[PDB]
Design a protein around this ligand. Sequence first.
Ligand code: CS
Lengths: 226, 229
Amino acid sequence: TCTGCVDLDELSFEKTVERFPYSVVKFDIAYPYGEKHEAFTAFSKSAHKATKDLLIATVGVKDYGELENKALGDRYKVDDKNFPSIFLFKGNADEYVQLPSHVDVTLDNLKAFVSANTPLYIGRDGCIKEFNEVLKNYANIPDAEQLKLIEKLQAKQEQLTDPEQQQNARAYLIYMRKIHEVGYDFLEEETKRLLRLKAGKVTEAKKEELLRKLNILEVFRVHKVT
Amino acid sequence: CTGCVDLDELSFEKTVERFPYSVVKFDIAYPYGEKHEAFTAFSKSAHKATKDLLIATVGVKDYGELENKALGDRYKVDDKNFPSIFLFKGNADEYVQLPSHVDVTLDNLKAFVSANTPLYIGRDGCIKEFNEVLKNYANIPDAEQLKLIEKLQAKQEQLTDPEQQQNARAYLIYMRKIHEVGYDFLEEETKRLLRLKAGKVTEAKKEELLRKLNILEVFRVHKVTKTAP
Ligand SMILES: [Cs+]
């Protein structure tokens, strides 16, 4: 299927959607693959890191054959012409919004579809929303402000529980410290390092970590330095 | 399987913690076979009976990127004695594991459930909302029977699930016959169905007769207290 996606059928569908605050469900071919499904996969992974309240699910509809989930495609008025079709539910299989048929299925667009329609926000992997808010043009604030930002965020660092997020905050703190010490030259250096490392010998978990670092690194970019 | 939700390292805890109870079968990825088919039958049965029970599977089948190996490890299960069946009580921390000696069958899974939760997976055919008001039906006065007939006929008309619609017909038949003839109907209809069931019947016809017998059983009374004809 896709990682962290829950594939639902006519018996599980409503009863599962009805247990979650929000659900985003991709109705598609029973054996989906291709750019759009990969984008929904990436979105499942990002969503799952970003929220506690959002079910990411798929329903595979088989037309001809001994039919699978055709009731569901019928209920939601989606068939071979519409796929993949993205629905967003809010606890009630009868109340939903459907991603406009003209919107490209990309991670970015799926993430905006959720934010446009729920209070949830799915940031970039590695980013910590709290940190971000206090970090814009960190690289242009005075050394003493920077030094202040470092002590506060280092406090939230140890108020955080999830390993992923604890690693993320440590990268933020490292970058604050480097950018405090080296100035903005740091960005390009760290970028080149992370990219050479990503384009080298490393695992599944390895390239994700490096991407999370890059996304965290991006927060510290400014349009002019001063 | 149908109605089983397959969960993985990302979806497991978060899904299990949204349902009051979850029964989870850990097994190889792409499971198959007789225990899997029995878990499948159980999923169908539980879904017909409750809305509070998640039925789920985790495919460990560890030979690759090791999907779900961490999950199997959290619960200390093993290629070595798959399947392992767990019951969770609303989070991924509170669970009971089905003893590895218990054959994984439909009956044992239902028992596991009723043994460990307030949930009840009823007998095939039964409609809980009917059974709730039918206890001792055969002994109550005619006018109460008649009111129950009117009430369950009204319920039947609102039923939206097709298996319950069909089962409800058998309840109404039995209520009306029992009203009309008395408790002797229970022997009459039992002999009729047991005769059929003792014939050469397919598995699907067998199931259909069992559902009628499970419904008729609702009407049996421990002692007949109401006068005959
Ligand atoms: Cs709900």
